[PDB]
Design a protein around this ligand. Structure first.
Ligand SMILES: *[C@@H]1O[C@H](CO)[C@@H](O)[C@H](O)[C@H]1NC(C)=O
Lengths: 218, 195, 215
């Protein structure tokens, strides 16, 4: 198999610096063309830099002089040293293996890490239950969920019953409020007799702030 | 007055692929370099250390004429201090290069309908080429930890790729014939002055 | 430079339909074009390279065609899993440019489905904070376009609510929407009737789910 796992992403103020890492398995980093490609929230893909097998490096015009691509043979890892970071640099950054036949094409990508460049500061979320209410809604299904409000930056992860609950769960994308933080909701549809015979717990994790909270609903 | 055989190099019928670039040693003749500068046939005529003006006034020990074929966008790589697939893996000029780089469009000759795939270029190399190094190896490139044993597959790729010039390729992707004249100067007596 | 323009940018098609996405380059790039498929919140997966050649491990319904300035990505018969944002990439420039397209968002089209609507009053633990957030939930509907109208004592609310939409479900190809109405505790206790009005293609007339503060 091939696997590319990326790290180093987080929150940095304008003008700061941060170094991403991409640990590769399935090929030798010192023998392949490697490239970073970033995606700003909601926008398309943008190639940032590439390193050849021989060692020569190339950069996009938007990141020249500020970013530097590197690699380590002994630990089989690619690096991107970002300096003088700006708000426009906010994006999800992918590392990918380049094959140089027929021009260049990226046949394996990492899953990606988020880099947020803002003046705002971290904040852990508040988790409020969305309790089962109105009645037996003239059927058999009842809805319950979690309100994950007022956190920054992205992302947060929410599972139900520590993962033992997945069928019917809807975790909505976070929307940014007027205040500068994020709020998210995750709901799950459930039969309207399991409310006393079962128990539902929501598992919110916001590691930018090291916040872990389990909240039971009804 | 034996005249240097520049017609052999510039007007050859077949040119070599860049990875297997051709070198022709030139000695014991007199080269009127001006005749080439004033031609309007060449899209590129750039000289380094030497000046292309006012240069049949010198004497050199040996002149080397390196000829190959690349695409238009890659001619910029045949220059001191450049990088890229051609400069790193096919043909490398030294940082202190003193000579002239001459190129001209050869789409009328080196293109054919359906594509002319006789011109190749090296794709993979663990190390950059040294100046004036010539790599003719065709052994399967090992991109992973698994040895290739001369068979291609995942992480085991053929190191050479074909250009594929066709007559309506963009001018950047059209074939150009390049000739690099390198002038060496030594303790030894000069053999090619070219008044 | 070089600019890659995709067409269309948004596209909907039903299961079994043939799908066609177009790429165009500002210069001729003879066949140095690739296609990538990026599903929501995941890494892009390569589909086609060299403008015609299918990547190993990709279904045969994905086809590549075109050369010069115009290229085409084709899906023979759309599958429920194939909703994604497809990008064409150029690999023709020296030095590299790696120009991408803006992307074509592809949604799966199905029969219209009316949404189940629920309403959640604020938690008394959140009312401890001095803030009251009411939630309106729209579950498993199609199409994506819906309207949520918050009403507090029949006073149409605006400027104090936001909403988010899930991506298409992978099997039933429906959407879900969650709209949050946020009030101060003081402002929340001033009124009694809190309702969200839902207008959707699947409903003969707007549905309104309501509760009364103090139940
Ligand atoms: C190549 O041939 C043309 C025409 O026969 C001639 O003018 C030109 O000088 C030749 N090139 C060289 C380097 O002699």
């Amino acid at each position: 198999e091939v696997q590319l796992v990326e790290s180093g992403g987080g929150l940095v103020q304008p003008g700061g610096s941060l170094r991403l890492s991409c640990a590769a398995s399935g090929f030798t980093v010192s023998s392949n063309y490697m490239s970073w490609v970033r995606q700003a929230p909601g926008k398309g893909l943008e190639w940032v830099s590439v390193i050849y097998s021989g060692g020569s490096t190339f950069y996009a015009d938007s990141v020249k002089g500020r970013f530097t691509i590197s690699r380590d043979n002994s630990m089989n890892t690619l690096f991107l040293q970002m300096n003088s970071l700006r708000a426009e640099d906010t994006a999800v950054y992918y590392c990918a293996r380049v094959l140089p036949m027929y021009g260049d094409y990226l046949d394996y990508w990492g899953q990606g890490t988020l880099v947020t460049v803002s003046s705002a500061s971290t904040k852990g979320p508040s988790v409020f239950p969305l309790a089962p209410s109105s009645k037996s809604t003239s059927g058999g299904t009842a809805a319950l969920g979690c309100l994950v409000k007022d956190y920054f930056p992205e992302p947060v992860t929410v599972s139900w019953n520590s993962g033992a609950l997945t069928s019917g769960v809807h975790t909505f994308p976070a929307v940014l409020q007027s205040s500068g933080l994020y709020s998210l909701s995750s709901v799950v549809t459930v039969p309207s007799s399991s409310l006393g015979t079962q128990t539902y717990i929501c598992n919110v994790n916001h590691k930018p702030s090291n916040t872990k909270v389990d909240k039971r609903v009804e | 007055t034996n005249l240097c055989p520049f017609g052999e190099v510039f007007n050859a019928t077949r040119f070599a692929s860049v990875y297997a670039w051709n070198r022709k040693r030139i000695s014991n003749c007199v080269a009127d370099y001006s005749v080439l500068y004033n031609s309007a046939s060449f899209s590129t005529f750039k000289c380094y250390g030497v000046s292309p003006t006012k240069l049949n006034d010198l004497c050199f020990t040996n002149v080397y004429a390196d000829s190959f074929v690349i695409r238009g966008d890659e001619v910029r790589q045949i220059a001191p201090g450049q990088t890229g697939k051609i400069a790193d893996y096919n043909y490398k000029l030294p940082d202190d290069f003193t000579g002239c780089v001459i190129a001209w469009n050869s789409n009328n000759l080196d293109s054919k309908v359906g594509g002319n795939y006789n011109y190749l270029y090296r794709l993979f190399r663990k190390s950059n080429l040294k100046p004036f190094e010539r790599d003719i190896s065709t052994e399967i490139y090992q991109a992973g930890s698994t040895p290739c044993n001369g068979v291609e597959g995942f992480n085991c790729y053929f190191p050479l790729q074909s250009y594929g010039f066709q007559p309506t390729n963009g001018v950047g992707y059209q074939p150009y014939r390049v000739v690099v004249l390198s002038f060496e100067l030594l303790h030894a007596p000069a053999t090619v002055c070219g008044p | 430079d070089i600019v890659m323009t995709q067409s269309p940018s948004s596209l909907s098609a039903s299961v079994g339909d043939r799908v066609t996405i177009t790429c165009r380059a500002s210069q001729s790039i003879s066949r140095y074009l690739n296609w990538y498929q990026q599903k929501p919140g995941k890494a892009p997966k390569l589909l086609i390279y060299a403008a015609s050649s299918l990547q190993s491990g990709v279904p045969s319904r994905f086809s590549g065609s075109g050369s010069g300035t115009d290229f085409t990505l084709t899906i023979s018969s759309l599958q429920p899993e194939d909703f994604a944002t497809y990008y064409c990439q150029q690999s023709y420039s020296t030095p590299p440019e790696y120009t991408f397209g803006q992307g074509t968002k592809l949604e799966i089209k199905r029969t219209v489905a009316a949404p189940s609507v629920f309403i959640f009053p604020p938690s008394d633990e959140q009312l401890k904070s001095g803030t009251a957030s009411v939630v309106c939930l729209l579950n498993n509907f199609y199409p994506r376009e819906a309207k949520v109208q918050w009403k507090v004592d029949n006073a149409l609310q605006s400027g104090n609510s936001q909403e988010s939409v899930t991506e298409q479900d992978s099997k039933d190809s429906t959407y879900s929407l969650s709209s949050t109405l946020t009030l101060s505790k003081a402002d929340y206790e001033k009124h009694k009737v809190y309702a969200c009005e839902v207008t959707h293609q699947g409903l003969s007339s707007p549905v309104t789910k309501s509760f009364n503060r103090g139940e």
